[PDB]
């Protein structure tokens, strides 16, 4: 059965609710982004209307085989009527095609569902500026002050300089980047660009990237591994065993691997600056864990919420324990008393 925080009161709408069977009274199913926890349950046998971005719609059709008649793509930044209710989709600054949804309820209440997001000050100059929000359904993944990490631009700076240095010292080094879902593509794209290479990958991953509307993509990626010195591999293979095994397959073209594991936050954030980061090393194999987040830091989240001044907050992440729920409610109250709403 569908939980409460995935229902939109006063509408026939649900958000990210495909794993519960047929939801009683749902006339339109919204999908915020193509991440498995959120799409869990969609397939070619789905026969209700799905509302989403163009990019999410490209991925439903080609990767999950959902039939075209049930895919309803909406443009961003545009007032649209769905089943008699005004909605807007806004860029979530999460992975490609990810959105927040503004719902204008028939009774005058305004609801923002963030999906998954990385709050940014640029959101304070979207269509959100214009009006009040009564309920916020908030991505609270990192809602605790210990959760700190750098900007995405600092992390990319570190990865580009690390890769360029290592391959300039050894032209026979191979760079490898881990992936398991969409998102974080700037990591491997930026490194390939500095090195003058295309990014090499499997047919399945190439298919996924071709759904993302990335400008000039055909110039940036390929399935011909031999011609590329930046390779993608599944995240589970980013370890000394998996990487050794991959170096054997390359036919004596390379004598070193430098690899990157983009993670979310890890506890080495609590001590080490991004500048000071070091790899794990065995022989001619080195592995860097880099904290490239597509979710808000605690400070980013707090800033966004203090600016929006919602009348009520409903968390959508970390809701399963009493301790987590109590912790999050305490921070929402400090934020509210500090800013005076
Ligand atoms: Ni996500």
Curated annotation (Swiss-Prot):
GO terms for biological process: cell division; double-strand break repair via nonhomologous end joining; interstrand cross-link repair. Expressed in brain, heart, kidney, liver, pancreas, placenta and skeletal muscle. One of its GO terms (molecular function) is beta-lactamase activity. The keyword Ligase does not apply. One of its GO terms (cellular component) is fibrillar center. It comes from the Eukaryota. It is found in: Nucleus. Its main location: nucleus. The keyword Hydrolase applies. Induction: During mitosis. The mRNA encoding this protein contains an internal ribosome entry site (IRES) in its 5'-UTR. This 5'-UTR generally suppresses translation while specifically promoting expression during mitosis, when cap-dependent translation may be impaired. Keywords: Cell cycle, Cell division, DNA damage, DNA repair, Hydrolase, Isopeptide bond, Metal-binding, Mitosis, Nucleus, Phosphoprotein, Ubl conjugation, Zinc, Zinc-finger. Changing residue 139 to N: Impaired nuclear focus formation, reduced interaction with PIAS and increased sensitivity to cisplatin. Belongs to the DNA repair metallo-beta-lactamase (DRMBL) family. May be required for DNA interstrand cross-link repair. Also required for checkpoint mediated cell cycle arrest in early prophase in response to mitotic spindle poisons. Possesses beta-lactamase activity, catalyzing the hydrolysis of penicillin G and nitrocefin. Exhibits no activity towards other beta-lactam antibiotic classes including cephalosporins (cefotaxime) and carbapenems (imipenem). Binds constitutively to TP53BP1. Binds CDC27, which is itself a component of the anaphase promoting complex (APC). Binds PIAS1. This is DNA cross-link repair 1A protein. It comes from Homo sapiens. The lineage of its organism: Eukaryota, Metazoa, Chordata, Craniata, Vertebrata. The chain holds residues 700 to 1040 of 1040 of the full protein.
């Amino acid at each position: 059965t569908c939980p409460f925080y995935k229902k939109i009161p006063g509408t026939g709408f649900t958000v990210d609710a495909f794993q519960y069977g047929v939801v009683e009274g749902c006339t339109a199913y919204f999908l915020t982004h193509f991440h498995s926890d959120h799409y869990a349950g969609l397939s070619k046998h789905f026969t209700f209307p799905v509302y989403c971005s163009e990019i999410t719609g490209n991925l439903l059709k080609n990767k999950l085989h959902v039939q075209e008649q049930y895919i309803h793509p909406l443009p961003l930044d545009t007032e649209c009527i769905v089943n008699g209710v005004k909605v807007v989709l806004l860029d979530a600054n999460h992975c490609p095609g990810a959105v927040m949804i503004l719902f204008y309820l028939p009774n005058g209440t305004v609801i923002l569902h963030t999906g998954d997001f990385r709050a940014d000050p640029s959101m304070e100059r979207s269509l959100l500026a214009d009006q009040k929000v009564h309920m916020l359904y908030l991505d609270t993944t990192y809602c605790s002050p210990e959760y700190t990490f750098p900007s995405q631009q600092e992390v990319i700076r570190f990865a580009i300089n690390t890769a360029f240095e290592a391959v300039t010292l050894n032209p026979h080094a191979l760079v490898v980047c881990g992936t398991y879902s969409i998102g974080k593509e700037k990591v491997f794209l930026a490194i390939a660009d500095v090195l003058g290479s295309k990014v090499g990958m499997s047919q399945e991953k190439y298919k996924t990237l071709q759904c993302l509307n990335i400008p000039e993509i055909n110039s940036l990626i390929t399935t011909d591994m031999c011609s590329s010195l930046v390779h993608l591999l599944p995240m589970m293979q980013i370890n000394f065993k998996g990487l050794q095994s991959h170096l054997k397959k390359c036919g004596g073209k390379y004598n070193q691997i430098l690899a990157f594991r983009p993670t979310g936050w890890t506890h080495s954030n609590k001590f080490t600056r991004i500048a000071d980061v070091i790899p794990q090393t065995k022989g001619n194999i080195s592995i860097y864990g880099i904290p490239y987040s597509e979710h808000s830091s605690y400070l980013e989240m707090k800033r966004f919420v203090q600016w929006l001044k919602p009348q009520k907050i409903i968390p959508t992440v970390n809701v399963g324990t009493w301790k987590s729920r109590s912790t999050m409610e305490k921070y929402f109250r400090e934020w509210k008393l500090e800013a005076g709403y």
